[PDB]
From a paper:
Sterile alpha motif and HD-domain containing protein 1 (SAMHD1) is a dNTP triphosphohydrolase that catalyses the breakdown of dNTPs to constituent 2′-deoxynucleoside and triphosphate, and is therefore an important regulator of cellular nucleotide homeostasis in mammalian cells. SAMHD1 dNTP triphosphohydrolase catalytic activity requires assembly into homo-tetramers. Sequences at the N- and C-termini of the HD domain stabilise inter-monomer protein-protein interactions and incorporate four pairs of allosteric, AL1 and AL2, nucleotide-binding sites. Nucleotide binding at these sites promote tetramer-assembly and regulate SAMHD1 through combined binding of G-based (AL1) and 2’-deoxynucleoside (AL2) triphosphates.
First, that dNTP hydrolysis occurs within the confines of the D2 symmetrical State-I tetramer where each Dimer-2 pair is in the tense state, substrates are bound at the Fe-Mg bimetallic centre and the phosphate, sugar and base-binding active site residues are engaged with the dNTP.
Residue numbers in the entry:
A (entry chain B), B (entry chain A), C (entry chain D), D (entry chain C): 113 to 589
């Protein structure tokens, strides 16, 4: 029941409150030691072997630091230690709902296995937090340190997910955990207004440390010049006008990361292969949940006791199996182990403001196969031999400019906020803020099938009006 | 079949020969992605989640770099590209035989489970290298690049392990892979004379990067001033006389690491608990090997096909099990998951150089139990409630001075080596080079049992003529 | 006469040829130990106290590394050790002509003191190299190591400066040092087609290390994928087509640095004050040159012996002086020592494609003073109380896109180069590549004077059809 | 009059109180921008170009951080903001008395130029602090922020230097700035009991950053486990018992630095040459002080107004001079500029516990010359051709063990301290804690002179009962 100290390779030595220590030392939280932060990227970057455990620790520490600084430099906000504990707990448990290989589970697998439900890992995080609190007798411990569980659990849940109860924007306050007087406390762990939060800072630093790519953003300088100001009967976190350029750079940094590591094409195809292996391995793996009931890999998100035992272990559970009824997924994983991967064909961009919707992906391989090239190639390829991948690259707000939703204050008048437009900053800033990319892969790896795949790709690219391949003079001359 | 580039957060961008790529892309080598470098230390240092895969990559790269530099600066040594390839292959496969949690498997488990055999992970590395070469059709590929497999496989094996075939030192050359005039090539990956090799450099850098501690050794400076000289009809690697102090510091660094991370009290007790869980879980886990035969965790080192599937996965295989025959090991692992660990009692050193030998460990708990305090508490304790751990801290040569087996050359006469004694360097250097420590833990966490545990500890420590317990006045007033 | 090793905090240990050591150990080169790399920026960033000596060392080392790698990977280019020595010498002596406080000497002082000559520090570098070679007896030493002085001195000079003796582009080869089949050797130290050279890499790394701003560019990866290909009967350095995005990022990095450190407001005004102090201190400082002749600060660029003694020392020579004729410059420097600096008024951007040319700067303060604001204040400010600074921010080629002059090759056909347009890369790239900024400062430092100065500034900005003052509703409401 | 932020490459962004800003913006403090931290070491390590300005900033910041942490974690000590300001000011102004090239001014020059006075740079720091406070009207500003100048100036002075007023240890409190119940505040900036203070931490970090050698000490961990406890009716700073080994390592680190950078042979001989040049240049340089009086380089420490203008500038003042009376020192500096340095002959250690005292250095070269070697030597060397340098390497307390004066506390009883002996820690620790080294250099640089010099060196070493030369079988066979 004393302050603990833990050493971090990203931050320094970190202090942990006894209640935080109690929360951490449970099976539900310890589950995070066995889930990769970057999923399949570890198969392209050999140094990316870190897990969500240290990421959660860092996010909690940074949330605590930011709230402490805000309270210290401006003591009329009425920030109490109860609020500090609540914010730290919310930051600590914000990723309890990630599945095997993180985003691959909720970005690729669940959509294809159970296409009738809508599910995100934040909902899973809320459910897992409820399960953790109920199964470990934590409410008395919270009451022992001055928390009020009925209000505070709701406050933490609303910190992890949106306002909840669905919105009705007729000039109303949607939240319930805290009054509007402290609305800024909802902008720390996850910022729904412009996307500036400590989670980005933490994973920027940690991913740059582990990948071998050097980071360019400085969050301590941002914390130095941060303030709280009243805007439109709404207290929000504001930066200083002289930091505006830095903010732009931050988003640039994020984009760069997505373009170098998270959307690497070999890593993406490896993730696709793992998803296909899981799809084939389904209907045969059993997980025991509450009441001795059995669950599927796809239905395990309906029971937290069963979901607690679903980690990256399942991967090695399929590779080492001997059951003759799991042979196909085992063959796929073995092919992964030999680097016999699906081969990349080409890439393209839409020209105009036309975009591919989510519910139109399944037909793309059919249209690539259905094309009729002019040149006559010997081999014929079916629509089952093609994989089409769509990538959405934006600044986090669907072609909106995030910096237009930030408030700024001047040195001479620190208690009044303003807005800055893009033309008041620089002429060298980007013009657009969202785009799509399309990659095409072929499953048949014959040196002959690749030529046919390229011919169909170029014909489909030409007739769809989707620009032309970069190397239109090298691979298709 | 072209040079391949890979990015490492320790060494940067690294080039790989196509034969190396063929060797890497096999199940036997890909096994190393699922075994941690530090084992249980990951449960004390949250950033130590790296595996043997990147360590092997780095060791191979550094071996190649050192041999290239030596060849470049001395063109009369007759170093060929065949030798470079062989040395790189040997460095790449040096830790190919580690088991689950690395040194825990061959340091704690095998000795207790099968105490009639003598086994090290280098023998396993040799066996696994043979299995890898035979199971993947590599000999033709080696022949394609100018290697002679019958000589070169023996050379690589002799690089990984000692001279082999038992020694008879009557003025003879024990090795077979290479003649006498290439002997220095046996000092790169593993140095049996004084212990200076690239493996130490690599894990120093990597462990310090991941743990959050900065190292003070520079190996590039050492490579700059390295040379090859003839000593007693033996060609060996020599450093320059001005680097002697640096060499001492290097060993100091190693000791410091062992005293901070590798021999941490909580990490060691966690490793002990995991070993106990594996001991109880044995006789119930089955692994399929060649011919459809079944193997135990302890007997899996007798078949390489079965050994290929034995990784850290087994840990999570026991925790998630439902078989009633595995309840005890599962209970122990669950205890670990709650931080309900065995409690540390005390520590001591032998003063009179009466080093406790290996075959006296099992009786130590009896001696701690079988000891009558003067004061009476009436709580009692069986000998089954005590854990005694013996730690050997040395400079790698069992109380010998390693720097006495190093050769040095001067600037004016670069082609003649000399020796330097400890009194020609400094008076502030260590006077001994080996020591022992003894730690005691109790398996009952009652606030009452802890007091009796330390009463027996102090009585037995006083009895055995050892030192008095440090800071004893506080815990034993 | 043996290879020398030197330790660098940016790179590692660096090897130096005996001829390089002879060149370094001369007064002309040792002069660089007393000129700062960033000039007045040291008065805003306390860690920027490095000089040009280490920068020159690093540039030479990197030039050698790049040429060595290019020769190693393509034996048909016929790169000899003579070329390596010549390139290293050119990289080592590329900044011999910098004056006190580096860019402010040839960017601010010489233009204002002697506005009838056109002078850059590269011409000074060539003259100083000639002086160094002639006054130290280096030609026989060059002949001792296989160099041919008559051709090689011209080659080095043409490496430091352009083709020389003016061009006539009627399909001719302008250079003389080397034939047309080694033209790529002219693209290493200073690149004229685009701005990709080792000098940028070196000062990026060093300035990021010293300022406390972290770097984002990786030049080793660039060296890994570099190649030489024939383009339009020109042998040129081409990059790998998958690195195009990285190249864009590089220029972004450069811009960021200019926006954060090199064009800081307070640093620029401090440089302006130092330039004014030097202007007033002239007519009174005497420097002895060849033949016992005396020279001025402004006329010292006409004699290299006199120029050798002109370093940052002159600064402290004025501050510690006692002559009554140097009193005004001493007062200005003393005011600098108290942070009684000229106060910043405002900033603005041109709206359209109109730009302020060089020969219109002197009249700008008159225009600002001559403006008639609407509201009336008692205080009247003359044109002598205003300072106007014009900043040009571009990608190094005056609103042209540098990436349009880069050549790329594909993996399948490594011996044929291609071009990539901006629309084949991304839609998030900048639209324009150059812009101007205008800052205004006032010399009178009382509050009424500042209010009046900003009234004139806003009136003039409105009059001349420029953008809004960012704080158009805060400081001017 | 607002908190000011400054960016540091060693620490992060640092906050500065307005009073600190007023103190910094004065000529006396700004003088530190032109004195180098390592003196002549910059001529061996090209990256060591930093000055005392940033070192003072860092020391002040770290003192503030430590006092803040101590006050925060233990609020019964009654630490006020007045104490924080006083401690920060003391840390900020602790090196105001350093002269040109720092330690060589008060370590080599003053002893030889004025052998009748005893002078250290801390006395100069106290005098310069008095001059700064009196010449800039700071007392009213201190009164404006709650300080009491009469007590507080004395407190700061006693922080920079010892107790003052000469000691009489008959159970009395020697200090006067603060009462006996705040005594721990005297252990922060400069620790006279055991030598553990923030100044060591700062220059460890900064010198490691600039030299290119990685640091091994972590001071943040030390601050985490620091506490204040009553020892013998004396409140003192105590560490945690588990950190004892770390403390040893810290001192090891210090020794290593002294053995690598600060006592480098070439750096020391360069410092000796600069000292000789200053000795010859004296009697001819005039500095103006108070009342229009003129002072010498050696007598400038008697007037603070004259001392304010004495920096490294004097170096370049002699090199660029034209007066015929300064010709010898100019020749010496010019010889330095060519690397025509005094040549190193040999090194030796005393065998027994006999040590060379300070007042026997002048006769050492006479003893070396007066030796009569047996072998026949061609040339004869006078005693003016020899230089003998004596180096004392200790742990900072004249062969005493510093760790014997540290107090420790246990987790169970955090309010009562203990002592730990060297045998309770490890058997691998050093046996002795101080030693002496003697280097010999020759001024005549021809080969015959070097051979003769080493013949005399070996004969004298044999005579004086010293350890034989390391390479006694290489250079003198
Ligand atoms: N010398 C060292 N240097 C850096 N980090 C270290 C370290 N030693 C440990 N760590 C890391 C390891 C951990 O991540 C963290 C805590 O290590 P402990 O201070 O050993 N904490 P514990 O609970 O064992 O001692 P107690 O309960 O008696 O107070 O710092
Ligand atoms: N911008 C970047 N910056 C740093 N590292 C990067 C990187 N991009 C990838 N890496 C890492 C990832 C890897 O660890 C390593 C090589 O990845 P690649 O060469 O980019 N991809 P592949 O081998 O398929 O190119 P090829 O067409 O020639 O086959 O560098
Ligand atoms: N332990 C060390 N660690 C890192 N850098 C060091 C160093 N010692 C010196 N340096 C730095 C200092 C220099 O920048 C560079 C050379 O130092 P020297 O090896 O001492 N070269 P010298 O000419 O004195 O010895 P010789 O002529 O007998 O071969 O490395
Ligand atoms: N983007 C940046 N990133 C890192 N450091 C920076 C920086 N910009 C400046 N620094 C460094 C430079 C300095 O060492 C320090 C302060 O820079 P200012 O924030 O510019 N302070 P000032 O007084 O000019 O603005 P005001 O008075 O309006 O508040 O941080
Ligand atoms: Fe997150
Ligand atoms: Fe190893
Ligand atoms: Fe340059
Ligand atoms: Fe200091
Ligand atoms: Mg603990
Ligand atoms: Mg999340
Ligand atoms: Mg988010
Ligand atoms: Mg590839
Ligand atoms: Mg091994
Ligand atoms: Mg070994
Ligand atoms: Mg040397
Ligand atoms: Mg230049
Ligand atoms: Mg340029
Ligand atoms: Mg300011
Ligand atoms: Mg001092
Ligand atoms: Mg001291």
């Amino acid at each position: 029941d004393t302050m603990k100290v833990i050493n971090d390779p990203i931050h320094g030595h970190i202090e942990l409150h006894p209640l935080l220590v109690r929360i951490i030392d449970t099976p539900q939280f310890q589950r995070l030691r066995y889930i990769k932060q970057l999923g399949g990227g570890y198969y392209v970057f050999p140094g990316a072997s870190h897990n969500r455990f240290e990421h959660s620790l860092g996010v909690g520490y940074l949330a605590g630091c930011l709230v402490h600084a805000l309270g210290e430099k401006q003591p009329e906000l009425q920030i109490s230690e109860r609020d500090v504990l609540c914010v730290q707990i919310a930051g600590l448990c914000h990723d309890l709902g990630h599945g095997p290989f993180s985003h691959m589970f909720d970005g690729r697998f669940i959509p294809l296995a159970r296409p009738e439900v809508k599910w995100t890992h934040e909902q899973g995080s809320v459910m897992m937090f409820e399960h953790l609190i109920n199964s470990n007798g934590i409410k008395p411990v919270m009451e022992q340190y001055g928390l009020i569980p009925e209000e505070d659990i709701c406050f933490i849940k609303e910190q992890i997910v949106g306002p909840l109860e669905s919105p009705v924007e007729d000039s109303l306050w949607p939240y319930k955990g805290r009054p509007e007087n402290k609305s800024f406390l909802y902008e720390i762990v996850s910022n729904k207004r412009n996307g500036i939060d400590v989670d980005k800072w933490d994973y920027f630093a940690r991913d740059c440390h582990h990948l071998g790519i050097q980071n360019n953003f400085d969050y301590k300088r941002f914390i130095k010049f941060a303030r709280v100001c009243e805007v439109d009967n709404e207290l929000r976190i504001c930066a200083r006008d002289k930091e505006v350029g830095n903010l732009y750079d931050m988003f640039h940094t994020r984009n760069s990361l997505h373009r170098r590591a998270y959307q690497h094409k070999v890593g993406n195809i490896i993730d696709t292969m793992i998803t296909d292996a899981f799809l084939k391995a389904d209907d045969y793996i059993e997980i025991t949940g509450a009441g001795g009931k059995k669950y599927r890999i796809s239905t395990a998100i309906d029971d937290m006791e069963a979901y607690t035992k679903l980690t990256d272990n399942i991967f090695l559970e399929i590779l080492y199996s001997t059951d003759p009824k799991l042979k196909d997924a085992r063959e796929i994983l073995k092919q992964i182990e030999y680097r016999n991967l699906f081969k990349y064909v080409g890439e393209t961009q839409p020209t105009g403001q036309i975009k591919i919707k989510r519910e139109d992906y399944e037909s793309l391989p059919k249209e690539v196969a259905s094309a009729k090239p002019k040149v006559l190639l010997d081999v014929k390829l079916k629509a089952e031999d093609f994989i089409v991948d769509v990538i959405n690259m934006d600044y986090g707000m669907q072609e909106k400019n995030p910096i237009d939703h930030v408030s700024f204050y001047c040195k001479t008048a620190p208690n009044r906020a303003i807005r800055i437009t893009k033309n008041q900053v620089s002429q060298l800033l980007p013009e657009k803020f969202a785009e799509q990319l399309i990659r095409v892969y072929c499953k048949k790896v014959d040196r002959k099938s690749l030529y046919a795949a390229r011919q169909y790709f170029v014909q489909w690219c030409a007739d769809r009006n989707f620009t032309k391949p970069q190397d239109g003079d090298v691979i298709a001359p």
